[PDB]
């Protein structure tokens, strides 16, 4: 899977993820959602090797959903990201490692703060104001370095994201067929249907 | 390495040089390659020093435990235990062992165990890198039922030539004589054997 | 390939099978592996068929010009020396293995030549994938002072051993007899032990069986003229 | 990777009573992709016919080369080249590129104008001549063609019977090869008339 | 997976009217070194079977012990061990063939080619081949290594098909085997002059011949051969 | 190999070719690349012939066990996921598979799932899989609409395989057609390309590149 | 490095008639350019009116046939001496072959017999167990030589009714056992001429409701 | 260079060639013309290895322009294509071959016929009604097989070409940034500026 | 291959086996490895047959042309021409040549030219694959100024052992005697030398 972006603004986290699924010669699908809801206020986008991506995402989803039922309580985004990191860090020394990079965007209901975690397939975790995986960051980080402010609104965050996607559509060789955008805030997770 | 075991009238004699090399550096110039697995069953080691020492130590253990239960083992029995280890672990070993021993019933016997782990009973045996240079000499000069003094001279002359031509061989010529009389160690220095 | 050569009382004889192969398929069932060099000098070839053919033809051409220049019958040693020096130059890349035999003023001769440029002298020789089958026969039966009748028998037997027992070799047996003071006799299809048996059916089709889209006449002549 | 099987295609030639036949498929491809269904592989220089399978750039190059050489031959000799002589010219020209060869499988077919004798020949890529009495095969379905020819063929077929035999040999061989087919052409050659027929075959 | 170290060369054999002949030289080679000159590679099993083995000698010595152990095991609780329940050539072969194929299938082969020659209970000739791959085949003549290339062509001139077996006597068959062993000594660089030969006959039983030598060798023609082409002296 | 399946107003069309190859050798022209799992489920086969047959036959057994245990027809989603989870266990071992699981259930409606041997599982409206997929896609995407007649949709699927059978060296033989509805799948015949091609050429006026 | 596979050559041929089936194979066994045997049977009667051949690497072929014969034996024990139908045999063979998917049996397998309606049946397998029922199938070294011929002569491919322009195909017919054996013999004679690994002898096993019959024919020994 | 298409209709040849120039990570240009006018009624489009493409095209252009001045005469499209084929066929056995595939579209003023030649880097020449190089043909030939007729107008040829480009934009993974289209007819060569 | 040249009182003797192998197949069992580059200058060839024949043919040409201009060349001169070819083309040659010759001034001389293209003048020389097995034997048994009969026995016994142990060596033992008296060819068959 190709491009996954994340940006943490004042009161929300915004995850943008490409729609293309390419198997070699042909583009098999142009509407693929590269994300799973782990809990009501925590969303994980993912990209990497075919099969491994979805298998890993759904495996994480099942474990967090199991935790939620057992304790009747939602884990913090920090806790979920640490769980995910450990699973990837365990994976890298396995017989066959998961080749999956993830972004975890969550709203911590205790602290009333949005949180964005970037974790690569090795289990390298970092909390960031904005993040990306693969070649996306090469184009988009210079923009985000320039335009980002911590006190941005969600609408300003989306405009800044449009500028990232336009730059990617101009300069990347692969046609990633646009992005599905999702916002994570105090009210939960919703999809921006027009982007 | 140049090693050999030779049967004769009164028993058997094992002979060896004393050079151990790591490439072209002589790591040990006074090595003892004649090693005891039982009172009157000895062996000559060639190949990986680690492997032949590891094997010889295990054989010595097996023959010690054999002796506690069933009395003195035959030279054939010793050669079989060597073979069993060498054959079954042929993929992980580089060992070329000559087994020599004295019974009163069987007298002197010599068994050679090359790389594959096969066994060959012989009147005499030669092995190691330096042996290639003395196949011709040893074949022409060996006789059966030699005396002790003749067999010592046969081994001394043989290993002298092996040492002369093989860089991997050298140092002192050690020998171990196995007869009814007991176990005798002999040593021969460069100034003696080089002028032969 | 099974090629062989052996000497007899007042001559030398060459033998060869007639199969050419491409991997596991038979390209040719009747090929001539006994190449012509001079009227009384012949060459059996194995290895790469194009190479064996080309090298014998080239040396044969140069031997003819040499013979014209010197006004002498060509010698087998001249063909031998020219072949080996050529083959050596190319370092085995011309993959030709040859048995050269002939008669000249010096006498009768028999040599073998390898692709890398080495030569041998012998009283009986064989080359190719069937050499071991042939040599087994030659080692069992060859003796000194063979008659011509015994020599043709032994040569053809050696080639047959290859034909039956070697997959590389097959079909017919070619022979060439070079005897002192006589014309060399070249005997193509000397034996024919592998004729195909009659087929069970005839697969000749009813006319019009094949569907045709178009027809036209091809103009092969020069200028249809006014 | 193997140059002789990038483009694909086949040629077969047969002898009959006072006649020869040479035939070829029409496919040119880039491995799996079919590109052209009009790529003829049989050419003629006077009354001598040459089929060529293998790498298509060399098929075209050699056609142009033998046209060149046979044109000069004719100007100097003051007669058209004969099949036996042309066979030797093909062999020569192939072998002179021994260590950088044309990746082709040529097939000569024709009737000697003086003796009236039917003649066919085949070559490997470096010029070794196979001069068959019965038939010659070449191309990516050469194994298939060997099987068809070896069972279907019988000697001394009349021109219109020989047409049926060679056509069925080509068509059924081509249908068992992925890289051959897409149409086919058959030349029936007699001493002073040549008929060319395009065959209807499955287009996959 | 290994590589063969000490090796034995050709084993050759053929059927004749009343039985089978098998032969093999007494050499154990160590690459190009002709190391061991007293190695017996024909191993009899009872009085009706001989197993001839080529290839790796350490793996041969293992197989030799398996066959020795097989005879012991057959005798256990078997009052007819020396009669109707004695080991047959076909039993001995099928056992070996099972072992050879199992070992190749674990990627750890016994690096040998084996010919089991014998005579069955009903007088039928038994002759079958098996190798390190578990490949098996039977034929009126069988040979391993260089024997396949040189001996078989000579032996097939005597017995070319099944119908030639009743027409071939033991004298003609042995002669053919002895000639084949000479040819192999001329032409196989890893062979020796000394060999062993075994005849298993349905009437006269097992005859095992040791310390045979290749004789009547033609070398005299060598004196006249001079240089490699143009040399006259 | 060219397999395709697409969703439309009147259900699902499934069309496949019939050729099997070993390199450039045409092993067979009469191969079945559609597996009938039950009256409402189909499976297409691309990639390794044995891998597809074995595991899609096995899939049918697992789908039968589901309905014995749950007294209910297996969902297309569940059936596709049994196969995708299986192949994922074998990932890296060298299985070669491209497949579509096509069926109707009341809860899902008509559904198509693409599953392959590197573990990918995708739901979608149109899929083409195999060496001739690009050729099938060309024809299919151009004439695809949601609201074709069942007769027109069947023709398009047939025609798309024909297009691929022509151009792709490794595709051919014959076209097998299926139509999946509320009531189940219906076979719409085996159509030999050596007859279909010429029929289509004349009636449609296409294939002008060919000498006809 | 040790190579566990080899190639013993040979060629086999199955043809399904109306109320019979044949499975033919040459009797030559080879390695490289040497003949191992001129008569080594390759086609076997497996019981229950089924004949089988696994051509390619002979050790894997023998192993597979041995295992299938044993599978028939245990099918009788486990299911009250029930006759193993040819379709059931075929599926059983798929599982034998696929069981070694990652260390395959290096063989092309063909079985022949009669289906449960008494009609002739041939089944054909790749080395890892993919199979199809066919009217016609050659396997092994000369399969490329033989199969186009069978397409033409058994299934009447590329053959049209004369005078119909090319619009009525030659209609499909079942062949008599005598006609099939003529096509089998000519296939192998042809294959022997042009393939170096084919020759020596031809053994044909014919399966009818009455049982399994054998026929043997000489082939060229070069 | 990626996609080059060609289609010969009733009275003209239409060449469409992608605008993208990608060097690895980035798209350096989105308006590149992958064509040279060889003569007034002969146009050559090209695609292949970087540098070699333009070097070869301009080398051919110079030779044909030299011929035109020397003889005061335009070579036929057939003659130009044979010249080009020979240069590529010479190239393939060189020290370093030209890795260039071309399409030559021309209007033969003698015969009053459009002509389209497809030549690959090996020197494999074919005259076609429609052609493509690289992966383009995998998508586009099935369309052209379906929709092409020899008596099509230039406007119908352009509509058929739009359908090819739409299919390529849907199913190809690379963003080739649209195509420059050029028409070759009796009046010469002109560019369709809106496509 | 087993080859050797031995100087003695009256001149020099060259000796060789007659076996040529392609792997384990004996391509020629009656090879003549003693080859004439001049009347009384001969050489023993080992290594690539093609290479040593190609070299020997060139040397013979050079010494023939030397003789036409400057009279009889020395054995040293012949060894130098061999060396020049072997050394300058060392990257493309596998040749191990022993050069032996008789002058009246210098008497018997032996020069060995191993793979590198170096020259070494020696009292005697051994070479080829089978020589490894007789270094010991030859060193112990060689004396200077032997008679003709002693030198023939020394070579016969030596090559007998080389043949016995080396598979690459075998067949007949050919010898060439070089003295003031002339050039004598000798041959010795297996039935003679094997029983030594
Ligand atoms: C037997 C040689 S063997 C098996 O190596 O012992 C014959 C000898 C031979 C000599 C001369 C002629 C004709 N004047 C024919 C045959 N050689 C062959 O069968 C060789 C293959 O041996 C390895 N055949 C060829 O070389 C063939 C050409 C014939 C079919 C006409 N060519 C090739 O196979 C190829 C050449 N280059 C390739 C790439 S493939
Ligand atoms: C086409 C797939 S492709 C390469 O994308 O064009 C077909 C699809 C297919 C699906 C189902 C069946 C049911 N029997 C058949 C075919 N696949 C094949 O043709 C594959 C292609 O190679 C991967 N062919 C094979 O799997 C062949 C089948 C034999 C019947 C020829 N087997 C092999 O190639 C093997 C080679 N070595 C083996 C061990 S298996
Ligand atoms: Mg086809
Ligand atoms: Mg096709
Ligand atoms: Mg044959
Ligand atoms: Mg020897």
């Amino acid at each position: 899977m190709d491009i996954i972006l994340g940006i943490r603004v004042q009161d929300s986290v915004i995850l943008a993820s490409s729609k293309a699924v390419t198997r070699g010669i042909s583009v098999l699908k142009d509407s693929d959602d590269k994300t799973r809801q782990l809990s009501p206020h925590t969303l994980m986008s993912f990209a990497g090797e075919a099969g491994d991506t979805v298998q890993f995402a759904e495996y994480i989803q099942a474990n967090i959903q199991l935790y939620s039922i057992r304790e009747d309580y939602e884990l913090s985004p920090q806790a979920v990201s640490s769980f995910v990191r450990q699973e990837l860090a365990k994976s890298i020394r396995s017989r066959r490692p998961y080749q999956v990079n993830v972004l975890i965007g969550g709203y911590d209901k205790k602290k009333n703060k949005p949180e964005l975690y970037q974790i690569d397939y090795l289990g390298t975790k970092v909390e960031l104001p904005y993040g990306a995986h693969g070649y996306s960051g090469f184009y988009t980080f210079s923009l985000l370095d320039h335009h980002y402010r911590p006190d941005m609104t969600t609408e300003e965050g989306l405009d800044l994201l449009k500028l990232c996607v336009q730059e990617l559509e101009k300069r990347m060789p692969m046609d990633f067929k646009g992005v599905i955008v999702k916002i994570v805030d105090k009210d939960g997770i919703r999809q921006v249907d027009d982007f | 390495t140049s090693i050999m075991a030779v049967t004769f009238k009164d028993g058997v004699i094992l002979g060896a040089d004393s050079r151990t090399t790591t490439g072209a550096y002589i790591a040990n110039r006074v090595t003892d390659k004649l090693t005891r697995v039982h009172d009157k069953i000895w062996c000559c080691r060639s190949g990986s020093a680690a492997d032949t020492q590891a094997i010889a130590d295990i054989v010595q253990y097996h023959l010690e435990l054999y002796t506690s239960q069933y009395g003195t083992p035959s030279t054939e029995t010793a050669a079989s235990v060597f073979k069993e280890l060498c054959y079954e672990n042929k993929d992980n070993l580089t060992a070329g062992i000559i087994v020599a021993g004295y019974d009163d019933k069987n007298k002197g016997e010599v068994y050679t165990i090359p790389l594959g782990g096969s066994v060959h009973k012989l009147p005499y045996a030669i092995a190691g890198s330096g042996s290639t240079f003395i196949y011709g000499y040893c074949d022409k000069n060996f006789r059966e039922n030699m005396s002790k003094e003749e067999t010592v001279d046969f081994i001394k002359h043989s290993l002298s030539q092996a040492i002369k031509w093989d860089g991997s061989s050298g140092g002192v010529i050690r020998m171990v004589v196995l007869t009814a009389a007991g176990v005798e160690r002999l040593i021969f220095y460069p100034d003696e054997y080089e002028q032969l | 390939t099974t090629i062989a050569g052996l000497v007899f009382q007042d001559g030398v004889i060459l033998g060869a099978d007639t199969r050419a192969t491409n991997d596991s398929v038979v390209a040719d069932k009747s090929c001539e592996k006994i190449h012509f060099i001079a009227p009384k000098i012949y060459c059996c070839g194995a290895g790469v068929a194009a190479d064996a053919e080309a090298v014998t033809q080239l040396i044969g051409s140069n031997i003819e010009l040499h013979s014209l220049y010197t006004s002498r019958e060509p010698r087998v040693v001249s063909a031998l020396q020219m072949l080996k020096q050529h083959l050596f130059k190319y370092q085995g890349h011309i993959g030709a293995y040859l048995i050269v035999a002939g008669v000249d003023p010096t006498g009768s001769h028999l040599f073998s030549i390898h692709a890398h440029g080495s030569t041998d002298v012998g009283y009986y020789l064989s080359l190719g994938s069937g050499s071991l089958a042939a040599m087994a026969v030659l080692e069992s039966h060859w003796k000194q002072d063979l008659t011509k009748e015994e020599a043709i028998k032994l040569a053809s037997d050696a080639i047959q051993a290859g034909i039956w027992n070697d997959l590389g070799s097959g079909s017919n047996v070619d022979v060439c007899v070079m005897e002192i003071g006589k014309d060399a006799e070249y005997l193509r299809n000397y034996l024919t032990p592998n004729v195909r048996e009659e087929k069970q059916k005839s697969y000749k089709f009813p006319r019009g069986t094949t569907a045709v889209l178009k027809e036209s006449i091809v103009n092969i002549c020069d200028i249809q003229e006014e | 990777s193997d140059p002789s099987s990038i483009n694909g295609g086949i040629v077969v030639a047969m002898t009959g009573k006072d006649c020869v036949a040479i035939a070829c498929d029409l496919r040119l491809g880039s491995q799996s992709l079919g590109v052209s269904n009009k790529f003829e592989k049989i050419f003629h220089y006077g009354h001598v016919f040459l089929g060529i399978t293998g790498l298509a750039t060399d098929v075209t190059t050699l056609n142009e080369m033998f046209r060149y050489k046979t044109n000069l031959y004719k100007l100097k000799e003051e007669r058209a080249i004969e099949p036996e002589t042309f066979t030797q010219l093909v062999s020569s020209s192939l072998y002179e590129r021994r260590f950088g060869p044309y990746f082709v499988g040529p097939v000569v077919a024709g009737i000697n104008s003086k003796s009236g004798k039917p003649f066919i020949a085949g070559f490997d890529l470096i010029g070794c001549i196979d001069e068959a009495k019965d038939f010659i095969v070449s191309g990516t379905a050469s194994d298939q063609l060997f099987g068809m020819c070896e069972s279907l063929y019988e000697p001394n077929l009349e021109p219109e019977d020989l047409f049926e035999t060679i056509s069925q040999a080509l068509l059924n061989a081509a249908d068992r090869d992925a890289l051959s087919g897409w149409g086919a052409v058959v030349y029936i050659i007699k001493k002073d008339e040549v008929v060319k027929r395009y065959l209807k075959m499955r287009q996959d | 997976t290994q590589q063969p170290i000490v090796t034995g060369t050709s084993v050759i054999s053929m059927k004749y009217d009343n039985g089978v002949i098998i032969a093999a030289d007494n050499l154990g080679s160590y690459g190009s070194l002709l190391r061991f000159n007293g190695v017996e590679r024909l191993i009899p099993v009872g009085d009706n079977t001989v197993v001839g083995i080529s290839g790796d000698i350490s793996d041969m010595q293992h197989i030799e012990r398996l066959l020795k152990d097989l005879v012991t095991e057959n005798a256990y609780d078997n009052p007819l061990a020396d009669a109707e329940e004695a080991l047959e050539p076909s039993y001995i072969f099928e056992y070996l063939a099972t072992v050879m194929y199992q070992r190749r299938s674990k990627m750890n082969p016994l690096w040998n080619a084996i010919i089991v020659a014998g005579v069955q209970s009903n007088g039928d000739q038994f002759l079958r081949y098996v190798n390190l791959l578990g490949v098996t085949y039977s034929s009126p003549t069988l040979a391993t290594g260089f024997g396949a290339h040189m001996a078989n062509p000579l032996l097939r001139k005597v017995v070319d098909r099944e119908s030639d077996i009743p027409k071939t006597t033991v004298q003609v068959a042995e002669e053919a085997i002895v000639n084949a062993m000479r040819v192999l000594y001329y032409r196989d660089a890893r062979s020796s002059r000394n060999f062993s030969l075994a005849i298993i006959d349905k009437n006269t039983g097992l005859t095992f011949k040791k310390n045979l030598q290749v004789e009547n060798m033609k070398w005299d023609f060598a004196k006249d051969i001079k240089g490699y082409g143009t040399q006259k002296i | 190999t060219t397999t395709l399946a697409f969703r439309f107003q009147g259900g699902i069309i499934v069309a496949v070719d019939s050729r099997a190859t070993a390199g450039n050798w045409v092993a067979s022209q009469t191969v079945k690349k559609v597996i009938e799992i039950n009256p409402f489920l189909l499976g297409t086969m691309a990639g390794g012939a044995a891998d597809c047959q074995f595991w899609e036959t096995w899939l049918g057994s697992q789908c039968r066990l589901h309905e014995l245990r749950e007294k209910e027809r297996i969902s297309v989603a569940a059936a596709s996921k049994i196969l995708s989870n299986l192949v994922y266990q074998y990932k890296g071992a060298g299985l070669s598979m491209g497949t579509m699981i096509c069926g109707y259930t009341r809860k899902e409606g008509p559904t198509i799932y693409y599953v392959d041997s590197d573990g990918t599982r995708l739901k979608g409206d149109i899929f083409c899989v195999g060496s001739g997929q690009t050729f099938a896609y060309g024809v299919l995407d151009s004439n695809y609409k949601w609201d074709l007649s069942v007769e027109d949709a069947l023709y398009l699927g047939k025609r798309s395989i024909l297009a691929a059978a022509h151009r792709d060296a490794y595709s051919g033989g014959s076209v097998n057609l299926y139509h999946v509805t509320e009531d189940g799948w219906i076979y719409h015949g085996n159509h030999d390309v050596g007859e279909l091609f010429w029929k289509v050429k004349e009636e449609e006026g296409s294939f002008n590149n060919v000498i006809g | 490095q040790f190579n566990p596979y080899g190639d013993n050559g040979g060629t086999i041929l199955g043809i399904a008639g109306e109320d019979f089936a044949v499975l033919a194979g040459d009797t030559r066994n080879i390695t490289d350019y040497s003949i191992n045997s001129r008569y080594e049977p390759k086609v076997f009667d497996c019981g229950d009116n089924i004949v089988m051949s696994a051509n390619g690497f002979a050790a894997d072929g023998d192993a597979l046939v041995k295992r299938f014969k044993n599978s028939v034996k245990w099918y009788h024990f486990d299911h009250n001496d029930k006759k193993l139908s040819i379709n059931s045999a075929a599926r059983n063979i798929q599982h034998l072959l696929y069981g070694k998917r990652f260390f395959p049996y290096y063989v092309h397998t063909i079985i022949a017999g009669l289906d449960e309606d008494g009609k002739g049946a041939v089944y054909s397998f790749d080395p890892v167990g993919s199979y199809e029922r066919e009217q016609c199938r050659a396997g092994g070294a000369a399969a490329s030589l033989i199969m186009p011929f069978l397409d033409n002569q058994v299934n009447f491919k590329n053959q049209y009714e004369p005078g119909t322009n090319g619009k009525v195909k030659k209609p499909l017919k079942y062949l008599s056992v005598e006609e099939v054996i003529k096509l089998v013999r000519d296939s192998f004679t042809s294959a022997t001429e042009r393939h170096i690994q084919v020759g020596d002898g031809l053994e044909i096993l014919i399966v009818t409701k009455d049982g399994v019959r054998k026929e043997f024919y000489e082939l060229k020994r070069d």
Side-chain angles (χ1 to χ4, degrees), chain F residues 44-156:
Chain F
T44 76
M45 304 176 177
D51 286 336
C52 290
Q53 264 191 15
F54 190 89
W55 292 117
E56 299 218 28
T57 300
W58 172 88
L59 178 61
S61 293
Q62 299 302 294
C63 293
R64 175 54 180 149
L65 282 158
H66 178 91
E67 90 183 65
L68 280 160
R69 287 192 275 255
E70 306 306 318
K71 308 176 106 182
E72 189 172 315
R73 213 143 234 109
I74 192 160
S75 63
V76 183
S80 67
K81 204 159 195 182
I82 287 165
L83 181 60
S84 83
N85 285 168
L86 186 277
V87 299
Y88 187 71
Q89 274 188 291
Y90 284 92
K91 190 175 176 153
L95 300 186
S96 184
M97 299 209 292
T99 182
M100 277 142 344
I101 308 301
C102 325
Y104 174 96
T105 65
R106 263 252 195 78
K107 70 161 291 253
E108 303 179 285
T111 306
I112 304 171
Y113 272 92
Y114 163 90
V115 178
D116 80 27
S117 55
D118 49 57
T120 310
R121 180 168 159 274
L122 300 164
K123 186 166 78 171
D125 294 351
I126 306 166
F127 290 108
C128 298
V129 181
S131 55
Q133 67 180 52
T134 49
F135 304 110
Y137 271 133
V139 176
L140 194 57
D141 290 333
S142 307
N143 303 109
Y144 180 80
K145 292 154 161 178
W146 177 259
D147 45 359
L148 279 48
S149 74
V150 171
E151 203 194 63
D152 282 3
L154 277 168
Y155 181 74
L156 184 56

Side-chain angles (χ1 to χ4, degrees), chain C residues 2-43:
Chain C
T2 311
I3 50 164
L6 69 91
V7 315
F8 64 96
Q9 238 163 265
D10 262 29
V12 60
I13 179 176
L14 292 175
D17 77 302
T18 71
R19 171 178 286 175
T21 56
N22 204 129
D23 252 308
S24 289
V25 311
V26 181
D28 201 339
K29 283 178 282 214
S30 50
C31 73
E32 311 186 73
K33 303 184 181 182
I34 319 197
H35 302 100
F36 174 94
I37 300 189
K40 303 197 166 192
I41 308 174
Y42 286 80
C43 200

Side-chain angles (χ1 to χ4, degrees), chain C:
Chain C
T1 294
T2 311
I3 50 164
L6 69 91
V7 315
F8 64 96
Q9 238 163 265
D10 262 29
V12 60
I13 179 176
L14 292 175
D17 77 302
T18 71
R19 171 178 286 175
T21 56
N22 204 129
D23 252 308
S24 289
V25 311
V26 181
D28 201 339
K29 283 178 282 214
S30 50
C31 73
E32 311 186 73
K33 303 184 181 182
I34 319 197
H35 302 100
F36 174 94
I37 300 189
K40 303 197 166 192
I41 308 174
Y42 286 80
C43 200
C44 275
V48 181
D51 281 336
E53 188 78 47
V55 77
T56 53
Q57 281 190 13
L58 180 63
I59 276 58
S61 167
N62 287 321
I63 278 286
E64 182 173 330
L65 294 172
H66 189 256
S67 183
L68 261 15
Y69 189 101
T70 61
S71 311
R72 284 176 165 73
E73 309 269 38
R75 309 198 177 176
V76 190
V77 295
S78 289
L80 179 74
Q81 197 83 341
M82 290 159 81
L83 284 164
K84 70 139 60 176
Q85 276 169 15
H86 186 82
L87 288 176
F88 185 85
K89 215 173 73 162
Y90 285 87
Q91 296 282 309
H93 290 290
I94 296 169
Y97 293 83
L98 319 164
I99 300 183
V100 195
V103 231
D104 60 40
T106 305
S108 60
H109 309 285
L110 181 60
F111 308 109
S112 84
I113 318 181
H114 287 233
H116 289 262
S118 29
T119 56
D120 278 308
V121 177
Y123 286 116
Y124 52 101
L125 310 160
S126 69
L127 258 38
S129 60
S131 45
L132 277 73
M135 185 56 60
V137 175
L138 297 168
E139 288 283 30
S140 299
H141 301 301
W142 190 90
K143 57 186 174 89
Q144 253 146 312
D145 297 319
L146 285 170
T147 68
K148 169 171 159 179
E149 284 69 34
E150 293 174 312
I152 297 177
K153 221 283 180 186
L154 180 55
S156 56
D157 281 355
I159 300 305
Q160 273 193 74
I163 287 170
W164 305 126
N165 306 117
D166 182 43
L167 300 188
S169 317
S171 294
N172 307 132
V173 182
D174 290 352
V175 173
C176 190
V177 194
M178 287 141 288
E179 207 168 0
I180 292 186
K182 299 165 132 300
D183 293 335
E185 60 175 352
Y186 176 77
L187 304 166
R188 179 164 187 209
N189 293 318
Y190 175 68
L191 296 181
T192 302
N194 285 298
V195 297
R196 207 237 253 232
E197 75 180 46
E198 195 193 343
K199 285 198 277 281
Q200 296 297 130
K201 200 178 184 286
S202 176
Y203 300 93
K204 183 169 149 194
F205 297 85
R207 300 197 190 172
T209 295
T210 306
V212 178
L213 300 181
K214 302 180 186 171
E215 263 193 309
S216 70
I217 301 298
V218 193
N219 186 80
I220 62 169
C221 287
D222 332 331
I223 329 337
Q224 281 301 332
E225 190 186 342
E226 274 284 86

Side-chain angles (χ1 to χ4, degrees), chain D residues 174 177-178 180 204:
Chain D
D177 186 23
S180 297
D204 64 348

Side-chain angles (χ1 to χ4, degrees), chain E residues 158-220:
Chain E
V158 184
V159 289
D160 208 40
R161 66 259 314 291
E162 202 74 11
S163 63
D164 291 339
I165 293 163
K167 302 172 189 178
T168 312
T169 62
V170 73
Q171 281 187 357
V172 171
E174 185 172 15
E175 183 174 326
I177 290 288
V178 170
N179 173 248
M181 293 300 296
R182 174 165 55 249
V183 170
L184 293 167
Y185 186 60
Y186 288 145
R187 243 62 211 201
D188 184 358
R190 309 180 79 190
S191 62
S192 90
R193 191 164 178 168
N194 299 109
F195 69 101
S196 298
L197 186 143
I199 303 166
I200 309 97
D201 195 280
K202 74 180 180 179
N203 300 308
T204 60
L206 204 161
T207 308
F208 198 98
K209 301 186 182 188
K210 290 176 180 284
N211 303 123
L212 269 39
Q213 278 211 143
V214 171
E215 279 154 29
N216 304 324
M217 290 198 300
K218 287 201 178 75
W219 290 98
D220 191 66

